[PDB]
Design a protein around this nucleic acid. Structure first.
Ligand SMILES: [Mg+2]
Lengths: 115, 100, 82, 136, 100, 126
RNA sequence: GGGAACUUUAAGGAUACUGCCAGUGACAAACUGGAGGAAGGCGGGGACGACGUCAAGUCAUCAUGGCCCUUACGGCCAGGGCUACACACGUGCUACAAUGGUCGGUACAAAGGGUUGCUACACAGCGAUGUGAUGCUAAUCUCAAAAAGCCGAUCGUAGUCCGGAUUGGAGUCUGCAACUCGACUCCAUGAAGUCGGAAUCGCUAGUAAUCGCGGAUCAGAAUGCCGCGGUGAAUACGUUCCCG
């Protein structure tokens, strides 16, 4: 069932299925379903039109996919523009939170590039 | 209804047991009931010390120090008993704490 | 970060210098070694030369710099590639 | 050793059927010292086979192990009587794990039933060992 | 250790003692809830205005015979070299080699 | 009427054995409530099953220290000693069954320079 | 209220010595199989390291011959660095899932630490934690929830309800001060990874494996080091080849 523009899985429980939308975790799904009054284990292929619409309305109040990506990109570019140390690390693609780089920085650096 | 409670601490169990024996013998001599001496569980602290000056992590010495304790109660004491305890000598290496 | 109940941290000797500079119309930079002081809204528009270990680097404070420490704008190491 | 002969580690019989072979199969199943889970697997599988067919679990397991006992292992090497039962136990454990029944106890009982019937992965492996063995 | 570093340590120990009382007073005022906001803020500034050496965080434990800043062992107040030497001659009471 | 002490791996069980009808209490719980593991229950009943006196006695037990297996072993040892105390003629069969001997295995200490009692850190020639 | 029985606490002592039975070995040395006993052939573990070797390690713990500096190679201070990063190697931790993950309920330890300390209980917060207050100088009060385990529900082999790296927001505490460069909490994000080439390491029983707990250093800052207990295996025919 399309929610927030996404085809969330239809054979899984609601609490799991809602997590396929960007920006919605276990906590957020449990709160959305608690608000609209649906059991977490209810399967998505068992929800009527009104039930789906209520979840859509609640999920609207939380920033999910495009707004969230836009906000993240803007925050990163603002740091890369101000000229702070964090922006300088973002520019060179290096750890931002004080981790060592003599070894073990592969998530940020990529596969090891030969000399 | 006053029961005297003496607590003995030391690093040496032979010395502590000698002092406890002296105390109980004096109490019985002047005439009084005594409970104990009652042994208390010992404290053990352990230390690891590098033996080489510069570098050998496995070359080490392991030391320990133990504190032993004893509890003695003098029940229904006589007037002379209290003065006898004060008259008793002081032994190096044994701490005595008497509560009335 | 620093707890909110304590508030922000600013060195007294730098705070007095900024007080004087803002109260008057001085254009001369403010020369400082205090890289741990926070940038307050009163800093905006001023110029502070911040120590980096060997040199004082000019910094022109904009609104977007408020809430950062002075030293976040003076890198202390030199790297150019292997 | 090079100077002595070590006595075989003697294990007690199991507490529910009193069988040394059952105890040894349980120890072969157990991982990381978790005996309780191994017991729940082995006893559960024996109960499953008993429910499917009314025979004594101990003698049924004896017969299945006799069927899955390899004669030799490839060059072929003559082996002492103790090793063939161990090899049968290991093959039985592996085949059940590779099968696909929901719980390990059930897929173990399934392996045992197939081995008894004479068509299964473990018995096929035994035949393969025999075929690469008797040639040399 | 160098005699200069030892003297540094002594000077810091003197400064901490000299400013110990006012530090406690200031921190108690900062902790007070009945005291008003401007009083608490003045306390915070007066705390931040004391000389750095008054802060006990800038003390470092040293051997006491040599001044070594590594391997301190609070209970004895000595570093490992001198502790080994002094323990193995019988001048540390109640300490023996440990086995179990 | 008869008392026994059993010990196994830091576990110590006090057993009081009397004539009765098969009642059995451990720390004010029944066997099922005390032990959720079935073989732990089997171990505790081995002696009276070997003796066939399962309903010919009553058992009041307390246990301290150790874990499930050690406590079950200590309780079995205590029951065996209680039976021996009650009827000395029964000690031979209990010795044959192996319930008379005390297991003396205990955790071996960690040693300086090693990861554990025996395990050694990885060696490399270079 | 009582009791001194049992558990434990901790000083002293007894006990195992081929002690007895059978076969056999030069009638040497001994070696096999049994009964009593908690334990039967060094009971397990720890400390203890002959004579010597490598002109092996340490002048940066310290002492010390000789040589050098002594307006500086001596002393004081503030900021920075020792944490850098095209790469290569050693030692470890966490996973790659169903003998598992999550959720609800409910059991069983030992050894250590505690007054510039550890904190019952109450309130506030989702939480790190904050405020009030109580006992304890500890076999008395406290850190303290053991975890794996047992019972039930769900997940159905999926890069997933596996994995938790990286990154954006918002906070707490220690501290004069967490930018370079602390730990921890919540919301969001959800990378490699499907059991690992040549080759190579540990371990012979309460061991390996696996599960949690404590301490020294120390304002704060352990996946290391030194300890503690819970659950608890497999295999050894043999010295030809590899190493000392
Ligand atoms: Mg040399």
């Amino acid at each position: 069932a399309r929610i927030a523009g996404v085809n969330i899985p239809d054979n899984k429980h609601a609490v799991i299925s809602l997590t396929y939308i960007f920006g919605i975790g276990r906590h957020t799904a449990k709160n959305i379903l608690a608000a609209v009054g649906i059991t977490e284990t209810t399967k998505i292929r068992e929800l009527d039109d009104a039930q789906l619409d209520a979840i859509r309305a609640e999920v609207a109040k939380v920033p999910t996919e495009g707004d969230l990506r836009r906000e993240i990109s803007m925050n990163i570019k603002r740091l890369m523009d101000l000229g702070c140390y964090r922006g300088l690390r973002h520019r060179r693609s290096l750890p931002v939170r004080g981790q060592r780089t003599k070894t073990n920085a592969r998530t940020r650096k990529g596969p090891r590039k030969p000399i | 209804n006053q029961r005297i409670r003496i607590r003995l601490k030391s690093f040496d169990h032979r010395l502590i047991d000698q002092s406890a024996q002296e105390i109980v013998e004096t109490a019985k001599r002047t005439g009084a009931q005594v409970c104990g001496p009652i042994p208390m569980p010992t404290r053990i602290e352990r230390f690891n010390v590098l033996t080489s000056p510069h570098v050998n992590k496995d070359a080490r010495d392991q030391y320990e120090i133990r504190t032993y304790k004893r509890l003695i109660d003098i029940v229904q004491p006589t007037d002379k008993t209290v003065d006898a305890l004060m008259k008793l000598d002081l032994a190096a290496g044994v701490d005595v704490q008497i509560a009335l | 970060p620093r707890s909110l109940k304590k508030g922000p941290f600013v060195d007294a000797h730098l705070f007095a210098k900024v007080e004087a500079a803002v109260a008057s119309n001085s254009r001369k930079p403010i020369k400082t070694w205090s890289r741990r002081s926070m940038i307050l809204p009163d800093f905006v528009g001023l110029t502070i030369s911040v120590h980096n270990g060997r040199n004082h680097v000019p910094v022109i404070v904009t609104e977007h710099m408020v809430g950062h420490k002075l030293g976040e704008f003076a890198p202390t190491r030199t790297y150019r590639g292997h | 050793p090079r100077r002595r002969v070590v006595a075989a580690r003697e294990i007690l019989p199991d507490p529910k059927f009193s069988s040394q072979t059952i105890a040894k199969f349980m120890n072969h199943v157990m991982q990381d010292g978790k005996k309780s889970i191994a017991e729940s697997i082995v006893y559960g599988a024996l109960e499953r086979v008993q429910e499917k067919n009314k025979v004594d679990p101990v003698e049924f397991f004896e017969t299945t192990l006799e069927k899955v006992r390899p004669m030799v292992e490839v060059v072929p090497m003559e082996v002492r009587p103790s090793r063939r039962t161990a090899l049968a136990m290991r093959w039985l454990v592996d085949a059940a794990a590779k099968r696909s029944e929901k719980t390990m106890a059930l897929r173990l009982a399934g392996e045992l039933l197939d081995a008894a019937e004479g068509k299964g992965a473990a018995i096929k492996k035994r035949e393969d060992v025999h075929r690469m063995a008797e040639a040399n | 250790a160098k005699k200069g570093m030892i003297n540094r340590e002594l000077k810091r120990e003197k400064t901490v003692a000299k400013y110990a009382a006012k530090r406690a007073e200031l921190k108690a005022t900062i902790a007070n809830v009945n005291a008003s906001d401007e009083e608490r803020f003045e306390a915070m500034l007066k705390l931040q205005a004391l000389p750095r050496n008054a802060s006990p965080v800038r003390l470092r434990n040293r051997c006491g015979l040599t001044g070594r800043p590594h391997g301190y062992f609070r209970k004895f107040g000595l570093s490992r070299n001198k502790l080994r030497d002094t323990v193995m001659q019988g001048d540390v009471p109640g300490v023996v080699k440990a086995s179990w | 009427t008869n008392y026994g002490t059993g010990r196994r791996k830091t576990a110590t069980a006090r057993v009081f054995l009397s004539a009765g009808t098969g009642k059995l209490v451990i720390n004010n719980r029944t066997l099922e409530q005390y032990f959720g593991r079935e073989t732990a229950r089997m171990v505790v009943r081995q002696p009276l099953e070997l003796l066939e006196a399962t309903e010919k006695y009553d058992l009041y037990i307390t246990v301290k220290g150790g874990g499930i297996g050690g406590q079950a072993g200590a309780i079995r040892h205590g029951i065996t000693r209680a039976l021996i105390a009650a009827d000395e003629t029964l000690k031979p069969v209990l010795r044959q069954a192996g319930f008379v001997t005390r297991d003396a295995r205990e955790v071996e200490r960690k040693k300086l320079g090693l990861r554990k009692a025996r395990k050694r850190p990885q060696f490399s020639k270079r």
